[PDB]
Amino acid sequence: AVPSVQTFGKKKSATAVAHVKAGKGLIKVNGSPITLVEPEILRFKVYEPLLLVGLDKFSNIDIRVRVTGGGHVSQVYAIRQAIAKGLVAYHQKYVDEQSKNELKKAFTSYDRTLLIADSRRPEPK
Template identity: 65%
Template sequence: MNRTGTILDLGFFLGVWHWEKGFGEGERWVSERQQRRPEEVIAVALADASIHGAIGFERGGAFEVNGVPIELVKPEILRLKAFEPVLLLGRQRFMGVDIRIRVRGGGKTSQIYAIRQSIAKALVAYHQKYVDEQSKKEIKDILGRYDRTLLVADPRRCEPKKFGGRGARARFQKSYR
């Protein structure tokens, strides 16, 4: 028996896999995880060297950054900056959406800016996909009027060093004698 057949048989035995009759797409094996998949959207934000991916789920309105509640994000001074989209739009717009954010790279400040951008982009994407176009437009207008960087990533990146100098543009001093 091939490898996938054994995995399916084992999954069926353990109750993880079951046979599902699809509507218009035929019959297939479905895992328990696929069956209970909530409505979700994925938004990616870049700020300086930080990369963030936010996933918006249909649930109770919690925010997590690397598995930790957003209320515990450090540094405390910039924590309010991460909450800007929530403060601008009001907590009621976020009540049905859980947002999980993964962050890596960059410094603390760029991470905070990327967190706020990914929260804003995830909410806009969620409203576009699962709510209606009108509410998405309202959210984009409110966020865009306050600060455009909540929706648009900063394209500036560090330029790599070239030969003939100490940095990207600096050259070694030239001597004629």
């Protein structure tokens, strides 16, 4: 079977499911290329994982992201979280753990929300 992994990113009501497998560097969101993600102003946000770890790592995998719920901004954050988690999980399962550690270190150094959910649960005072 083709090696594949599945991950979830979540932001408010927005939920993104990322499927990462062996491939040739094909990143798609909702059946379209990642370059067409909207709004354009926040597009680089969803690019943040791809750029932080370098496009060379993605040359050997295909990522498919399906997003449902929430608004534009929350959907963007769900997409980026799902992409980062999927890359880390794939490198965990089907590549050395050293690269997993480097990926986690880079993502956590830049923005921990890429990996851990940002949940603003109420806190009474």
